């Protein structure tokens, strides 16, 4: 009950960010991430309460931090929460983490939203979602404000609306997905997705394809928008070994769309600093992960993965290309005093014929305490 199970997260988090192309931006921040989490009240309803706190200090563009270049800021986040059944409601501050919204933890802080959420899962092995959103904190900000979409930062919207549904089934090997949401005035898509999972022989082989189709919604405040994105990432995994394949198309007059300040986390082809979602890309993409534990470095994993873009049009022409590099070490301390720290190094190369081309390195040393 309520106090009973209450999980209570703090993790310190000191970022060093590097992006050198205006050819340089150094920022040294230190960040602190409170997360409670109540437990349920007995009973036919249970009731319970959420909060998050958010605080963070420059220390020799405000990508670790709002520039006024501020010394530090920071926020408190508070959601009732109330089950019944197999369905739980949200209302308050919270964290949405679903295909046509993920909330960005990029750089210092996380980004947060507001409004409420419910996950109903009555029947087995299938989840209902729908919520409202009408209020957002970018993650370089203390502060609240109206949603808006990346292809009109600047064009505000009344709210995101959404409704959705995955189904596992199999032996949790597959699943389907469907989702449809709605950025007010602004833009409305649809979402389907499929994802498979598994393990022939010595390899674990799976699939995660997507499908988008955005259409631009009401006062169309960014613009006409007709567009499909299309994509296919594949993996296959033996032993300590991962590779990864990624095929993707966008189609249409414009963009893939999405939630400013949000992740692309959920496109196939989506690296550090940009999926290729610009109008009529084309890209594909490789990737390689390894456990270094093969190697008696039992707490490193590593992975570099590279990705071009093609025939993208944007305000700068047609049959724009692009490619980025991703490289990244993380070593966990697996056991003693130190252990659960965590260190990512990790370095991006980017180059685009429709915009600045730069380079980016990060460290990232992150300690988690836990009650």
């Not at 369905?87 to 409420?116: A, V």
Request: aromatic share 12%.
């Amino acid at each position: 009950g309520f106090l009973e199970d209450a999980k209570t997260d703090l993790v310190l988090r000191n970022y060093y960010f590097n992006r050198d192309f205006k050819s340089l931006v150094d920022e040294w921040a230190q960040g602190f991430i409170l997360k409670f989490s109540s437990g349920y009240t007995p009973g036919t309803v249970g009731v319970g309460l959420d909060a998050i706190g958010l605080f963070g200090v420059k220390l020799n563009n405000s990508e670790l931090l709002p520039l006024h270049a501020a010394d530090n800021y920071g926020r408190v986040g508070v959601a009732a929460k109330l089950r019944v059944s197999a369905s739980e409601l949200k209302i308050g501050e919270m964290l949405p983490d679903i295909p046509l919204l993920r909330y960005d933890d990029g750089r210092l802080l996380p980004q947060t939203f507001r409004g409420f959420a419910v996950v109903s899962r009555e029947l087995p092995g299938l989840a209902l979602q729908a919520g409202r959103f009408d209020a957002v904190s970018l993650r370089n900000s203390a502060d609240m404000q109206d949603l808006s979409a990346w292809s009109a930062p600047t064009q505000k919207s009344d709210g995101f609306n959404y409704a959705g549904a995955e189904y596992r089934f199999n032996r949790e090997r597959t699943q389907l997905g469907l989702w449809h949401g709605q950025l007010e005035d602004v833009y409305r898509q649809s979402y389907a997705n499929l994802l498979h999972k598994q393990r022939v022989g010595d390899w674990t082989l799976g699939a995660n394809l997507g499908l988008f189709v955005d259409r631009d919604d009401g006062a169309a405040r960014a613009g006409e928008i007709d567009s499909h994105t299309v994509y296919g990432l594949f993996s296959a995994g033996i032993g300590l070994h991962t590779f990864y394949l990624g095929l993707q198309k966008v189609g249409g007059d414009s963009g893939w769309q999405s939630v400013y300040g949000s992740s692309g986390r959920s496109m196939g082809n989506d690296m550090f600093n940009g999926n290729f979602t610009n109008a009529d890309e084309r890209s594909w993409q490789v990737r390689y992960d390894y456990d270094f534990v093969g190697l008696g470095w039992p707490g490193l994993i590593g992975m570099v993965r590279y990705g071009h873009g093609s025939n993208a049009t944007t305000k700068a022409g047609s049959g724009g290309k692009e490619w980025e590099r991703d490289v990244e070490l993380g070593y966990t301390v697996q056991s003693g005093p130190l252990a659960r720290l965590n260190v990512r190094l990790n370095h991006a190369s980017n180059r685009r014929s429709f915009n600045s081309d730069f380079d980016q390195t990060r460290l990232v040393v992150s300690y988690p305490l836990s009650w």
